[PDB]
Structure 1
Amino acid sequence: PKFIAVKLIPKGPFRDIPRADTLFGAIGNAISAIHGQSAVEELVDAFVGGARISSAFPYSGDTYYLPKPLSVEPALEGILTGLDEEERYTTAKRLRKAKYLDLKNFELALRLRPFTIPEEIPYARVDVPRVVLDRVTQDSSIYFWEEIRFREKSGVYFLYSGPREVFDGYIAPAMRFLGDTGIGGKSTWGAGLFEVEFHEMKIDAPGSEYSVTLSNALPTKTPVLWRLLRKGGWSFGRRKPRMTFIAEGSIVKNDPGGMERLELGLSHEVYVYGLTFPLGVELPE
């Protein structure tokens, strides 16, 4: 359907490409700073009974990328029946270990029709060494640090499916606050800062029972095909426990996900996002 694409245009490096739960954490910290704690209680109720966001995905000059569905691994041989058998093998494993697809090839994978992978990835994970100096006797003691560096026009976007009144009051003021603070990572070195633009993107998805998630979900029942993403977090200097999420591109059958509340012994409850973002998919046989 029609989604709102929040385009995040980088001012520097990112620590990571932010998952859906560290965007909802960053949005939730932005609302209590701007409005207060009573507006976070309404932000959560608008996503429980309503709107849903996704993980962050890369783009490269108006070429939006989307995760590869997990439906195309069982039936990969069935997709490539019309191909020369001397090169079906190298085409298969190159297509299988790919991570992202653009909008032309993401639509063709939901209907189990043939497709191609991108040739270039719009970012690189870079190992930058830093140093720690003694103030008096300047002894160098290095450590190693990871960053995501983007190309000249590339960046990060995420999707939003919900009512316009909630987007105009909660998500749109949060992304102007989060442009000046960070979006996860060493934000004191200028990492995570970005300029925000708003667009509209359309995905042509088939109608079925089975659907792929474009976000981490924390499923309420057993999924159909999935990839376990095991992450925790950190909330105001308190360590969050590692929860078993589902990855982007995993396949559920009528599963909303569910928003987990962790006591965490903090002034206020900590909600971890965990909700689906379904687009219909055709499974193999």
Structure 2
Amino acid sequence: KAKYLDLKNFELALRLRPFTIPEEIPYARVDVPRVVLDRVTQDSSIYFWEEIRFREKSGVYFLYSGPREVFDGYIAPAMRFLGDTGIGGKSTWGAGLFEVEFHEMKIDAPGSEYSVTLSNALPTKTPVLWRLLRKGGWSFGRRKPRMTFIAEGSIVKNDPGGMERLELGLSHEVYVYGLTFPLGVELPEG
């Protein structure tokens, strides 16, 4: 039933060892009610709204693996500009904002031809075992079509993934990141 595993326990399930789930999840998806008030008569108009609320120490991270001259040239500027305009959501209510610190992190992968993907897969050939996911974005007020990404933790064999550029009627072309993030895994018989 679980959805996340710890860094110690994610390494064990790559080798098919017995392991343990975490006990508490860090975030709490809460729903706050807001209101909409007219300016002349102060008359209410309620609407619900819901967002992820994180704890005191906790937070969110992600990974990067590649040439560091592409990291420091591109990402580390972008994560300082994105500390002051949010990662989506109603980021005029201070929702997506954060502060950034970078680190190094090590996951041991057993050498085998199967691999779990730590990002949305969007495969070119059919994977082995996959938890499917339908989402679509919004580029500059234009709706993106729903695409069949695969959720994180599905198993491909030697699949590089892809990116599909989209038209959307903008001045520039719009790419959708679906490059896989393969870490090696040992599969059972099937």
Which one has the bigger helix percentage? 1
Counterpart in the other structure of 1:166: 70
> Which digits, 9 at most, give the CA deviation of each residue in 1:10-46, with x for residues without a partner?
xxxxxxxxxxxxxxxxxxxxxxxxxxxxxxxxxxxxx
In 1, Cα distance between the equivalents of 2:80 and 2:11?
Answer: 32
In 2, Cα distance between the equivalents of 1:136 and 1:158?
Answer: 47
Counterpart in the other structure of 1:132: 36
Cα shift at 1:235 = 0.3
In 2, Cα distance between the equivalents of 1:238 and 1:136?
Answer: 33
Instruction: Give aligned pairs, total.
Output: 189
Cα shift at 1:260 = 0.7
| 1:240 aligned onto 2:144 | yes
Counterpart in the other structure of 1:112: 16
In 2, Cα distance between the equivalents of 1:207 and 1:144?
Answer: 48
Q: State the identity %.
A: 100
TM-score (normalised: structure 2): 0.99
Which one has the bigger strand percentage? 1
What SS does the aligned partner of 2:56 have? coil
Q: Which runs of 5+ in 1 are unaligned?
A: 1-96
Q: State which of 84, 92, 101 in structure 2 corresponds to 1:197.
A: 101
Cα shift at 1:171 = 0.5
Q: Which runs of 5+ in 2 are unaligned?
A: none
Cα shift at 1:155 = 0.2
> Which digits, 9 at most, give the CA deviation of each residue in 1:118-143, with x for residues without a partner?
00100100100000001111111111
Structure showing greater relative contact order (alpha-carbon pairs closer than 8 Å, 6 or more residues apart): 1
Q: State which of 119, 123, 127 in structure 2 corresponds to 1:219.
A: 123
What SS does the aligned partner of 2:104 have? strand
In 1, Cα distance between the equivalents of 2:10 and 2:131?
Answer: 18
Cα shift at 1:263 = 1.1
In 1, Cα distance between the equivalents of 2:62 and 2:34?
Answer: 31
Deviation above 2 Å: which 4+ runs of structure 1?
none
CA RMSD of aligned residues (A): 0.5
> Which digits, 9 at most, give the CA deviation of each residue in 1:122-176, with x for residues without a partner?
0100100000001111111111111111111000000001000000110000000
